[PDB]
Amino acid sequence: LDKVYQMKSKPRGYCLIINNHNFAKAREKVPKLHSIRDRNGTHLDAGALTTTFEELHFEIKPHDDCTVEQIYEILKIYQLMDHSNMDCFICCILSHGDKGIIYGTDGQEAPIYELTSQFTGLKCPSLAGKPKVFFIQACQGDNYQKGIPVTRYIPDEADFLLGMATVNNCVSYRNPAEGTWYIQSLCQSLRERCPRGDDILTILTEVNYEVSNKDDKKNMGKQMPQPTFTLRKKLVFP
């Protein structure tokens, strides 16, 4: 039988949501960001994630409109917490971004690796051997993706799943009336498939399929999400 991460504690763990909507300070402070838009629609992503992961028995921890400094202070608070009685940690970041980074609402940059590496085995021992899941909804550049017709020691960086809304160098999309292509597809697939016992890689493959089928007709644009993982077991949310 396939190895599966333990996933039975109540709660399963914390699910942080860093939900950046108001970019007034970025527009003021950073010259090239003078017209960066407030992220209308992001409330629908936060709401879907909250519902989805509450139903999966996570404890939801929302934080709205975080500067880069505040994001680091929040992740440090969780890095230093005792997760011994938890089975999992999830962090959802909803923001603007560019290649390898996400923006704080002040327009400063936070390298994604600087965020995730706060939860390695050495930095957060009470999460060692437990899945650390990051979902990043941000652009990773400004290119439109084109479309074509058809005991034991384990590594410090083990047990991570990084769900990116897009491949490097390209945009991801937000509909103010709906939420984002990626987070909305992710929650739909989690809600349909977790009750069937499907694992997160199966689910993220479906998210790839669904988001791939959407179109930005005005720019003949597409979006290609991209998971990366160092998971050593099947990840299911019962």
Please tell me the count of residues contacting other proteins according to CB under 8 A: 21
Round to whole Å and give the CA distance between 172 and 177. Answer: 16
The verdict on whether omega for the bond into residue 62 sits within 30 degrees of 0, i.e. cis, is: no
Residue 31: what are its φ and ψ, rounded to 5°? -50, -45
Q: Report if residue 32 touches other proteins, rule: CB under 8 A.
A: no
Sign of torsion over alpha carbons 54, 223, 165, 38: negative
- Map tokens 């991209």 to a residue: 226
Round to whole Å and give the CA distance between 1 and 31. Answer: 56
What string of H, E and C letters represents the secondary structure of 84-132? CCCCCEEEEEECCEECCEEECCCCCEEEHHHHHHHHCCCCCHHHCCCCE
Which residue in 66, 83, 91, 96 is the catalytic one?
A: 96
Residue 57 appears among annotated catalytic residues: no
Round to whole Å and give the CA distance between 36 and 155. Answer: 39
Q: Report if residue 171 touches other proteins, rule: CB under 8 A.
A: yes
Residue 37 or 99 having the CB closest to other proteins? 37
Per CB under 8 A, which region of 7-15, 58-66, 89-97, 149-157 contacts other proteins?
89-97
Residue 124 appears among annotated catalytic residues: no
Q: Say which amino acid occupies 84.
A: S
**212, 224 contact by CB (below 8 A):** yes
Shortest Å, Cβ 181 to other proteins: 9
What order of strands is seen across the sheet that includes strand 97-98?
97-98, 101-103, 109-111
Q: Report if residue 101 touches other proteins, rule: CB under 8 A.
A: no
Residue 8 or 218 having the CB closest to other proteins? 218
Shortest Å, Cβ 148 to other proteins: 20
Name which of residues 207 to 236 contact other proteins (CB under 8 A): 216, 218
Which residue in 66, 124, 139, 170 is the catalytic one?
A: 139
Residue 59 or 98 having the CB closest to other proteins? 98
Residue 7 or 138 having the CB closest to other proteins? 138
Residue 8 or 217 having the CB closest to other proteins? 217
Q: Which of 6, 28, 34, 40 binds other proteins (CB under 8 A)?
A: 40
Name which of residues 124 to 143 contact other proteins (CB under 8 A): 137-139, 142
Active site members = 96, 139
Which stretches of the chain bind other proteins, using CB under 8 A? 37, 39-41, 95-97, 137-139, 142, 165, 171-176, 180, 216, 218
